């Protein structure tokens, strides 16, 4: 989540005074080209480099990726609620995430670089096959980056991470 290795160059800027959502691109400082769901949405020629998605109030969502002098970065699936993507479901105060690639192998999860859904010692965090359940979802505590990966593989090799921000 915090790291860009594995071509996960797009990150959410966590330091806004106003409820605006800014994306950053960790690529060779030159000319950044931004994309959303495959189509180009911007071309930054020097000067600015961060991409503004607007206020977090309009629930920005989509597969965003950037590109400098090299190839496109992997996407960062943004999902606000104030290639097959992660499915997000909200029911009352419960947030359910569904892993995009579930070949029947053991699916593991991480939230901001920390494993979750493993220990049965948590009544509010359950893992059932390709589904991660978060009961009594805490906006300021559980929002952030999520990723599912099969046992044995590196999380960084995931096709893309999910950035979840939800007020419940």
């Amino acid at each position: 989540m915090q790291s860009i290795k594995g071509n996960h160059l797009v990150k959410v800027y966590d330091y806004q005074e106003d409820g605006s959502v800014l994306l950053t691109c960790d690529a060779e400082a030159k000319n950044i080209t931004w994309f959303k769901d495959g189509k180009m949405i911007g071309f930054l020629t020097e000067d600015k480099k961060k991409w503004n998605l607007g206020s977090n109030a309009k629930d920005p969502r989509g597969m965003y990726q950037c590109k400098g002098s090299q190839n496109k970065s992997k996407p960062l699936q943004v999902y606000y609620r104030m290639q097959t993507p992660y499915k997000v479901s909200i029911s009352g105060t419960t947030v359910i995430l569904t892993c995009p690639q579930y070949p029947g192998s053991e699916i593991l999860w991480q939230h901001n670089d920390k494993n979750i859904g493993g220990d049965e010692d948590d009544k509010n965090i359950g893992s059932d096959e390709d589904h991660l359940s978060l009961k009594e979802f805490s906006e300021l505590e559980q929002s952030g980056y999520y990723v599912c990966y099969p046992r044995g593989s590196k999380p960084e090799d995931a096709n893309f991470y999910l950035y979840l921000r939800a007020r419940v």
Partner: antibody
Amino acid sequence: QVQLQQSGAELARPGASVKMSCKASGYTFTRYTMHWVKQRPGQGLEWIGYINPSRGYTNYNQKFKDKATLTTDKSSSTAYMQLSSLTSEDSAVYYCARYYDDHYCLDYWGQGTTLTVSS
Amino acid sequence: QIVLTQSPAIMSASPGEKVTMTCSASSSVSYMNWYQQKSGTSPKRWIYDTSKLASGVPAHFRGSGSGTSYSLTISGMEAEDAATYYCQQWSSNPFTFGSGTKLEINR
């Protein structure tokens, strides 16, 4: 201080079944998957499968499906592997080993259990 | 599924020589491990995550590689380095081992 103590050598007749053990200590037993490896005389290593002691999740090498059955006993921190419908092809040394996710490898291995299948 | 072809299958090196053994994967893998096994004993974790040496492993050992080609190097063969080395991957299911390289010490 991680230790994996496997059960003693065994002799079983063709067609029978055998259950061997691996007693772990020195780490949180339910926190790491336990794997089993097969090594025939003068041969290489072969992966059988693994089990997650947490809730009993298991996965197998297709070649060992229905031949090997992995189980664990939390209260005794012991993993078990049962081999059924034995033949001379099953005679070999069997190792149990802890998979340490942060290092992506089997970091600690049991001393191994030799299985002889003969009449 | 993923086949790991090790070469050479058998080799011997005089003390002090630089030994290089390779592991070629049939498909790309993000990392490779290496286990050392000496006669009559269990395999030992030797090199993990491609290039990290397990604690206690002589520093003159080195692991490297990427994609479909990996190798283990011994810079300055010592008698105690003689053994059989197996590479292993788990970037794709099922987890698989290479057939091993048997290394003898010349004298």
